[PDB]
Design a protein around this ligand. Sequence first.
Ligand SMILES: NC(=O)c1ccc(O)cc1O
Ligand SMILES: [Cl-]
Length: 210
Amino acid sequence: EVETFAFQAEIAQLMSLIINTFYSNKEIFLRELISNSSDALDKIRYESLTDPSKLDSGKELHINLIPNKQDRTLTIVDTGIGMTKADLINNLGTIAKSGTKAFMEALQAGADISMIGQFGVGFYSAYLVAEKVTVITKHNDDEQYAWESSAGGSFTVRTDTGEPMGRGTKVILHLKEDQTEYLEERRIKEIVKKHSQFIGYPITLFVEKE
Ligand SMILES: NC(=O)c1ccc(O)cc1O
Ligand SMILES: [Cl-]
């Protein structure tokens, strides 16, 4: 069924800082998540160079952006390497304790929240715009898992019996009520063009039934 875990104290503090700090430039969350997708896609590509069978779970390396105004969700889907259960529990495959230290040492040496990705913890920028984040992931040779957190110091992990993914990671942002601009096609397109114009994988922005 469902396992509930406490965030490490430093990660809880990172999340509080992101949620509570007054900071208007919230759109960098999308750059940060697309960058994490690109890094995951680079990892499966590198493994495939010496073991082509690594791509038996899907040959196409890409990123989909899926807005849903009914559900108030923005979903970022990649076909990258995915995460094991251990990776999910260990801060979504990050060195988040040491990265959070460096980041907060930078925020005192002048830096701003937009530089979060330089510290390896850009996933947590999702909480600039999301009240809840759900991560569905599938790594070769492991099962499909669902991570979830509304912050407040805990996350859950369960085996996902939802729609099978093949391989990769899906980040489902349940947007805050005042952050629905990130479901509008023109706003998403503007952000991708501004901050993600050189990413080396196709980024397909899905459209909705009007
Ligand atoms: N390593 C991963 O699978 C991964 C983690 C976080 C994220 O936002 C995207 C990802 O592909
Ligand atoms: Cl660490």
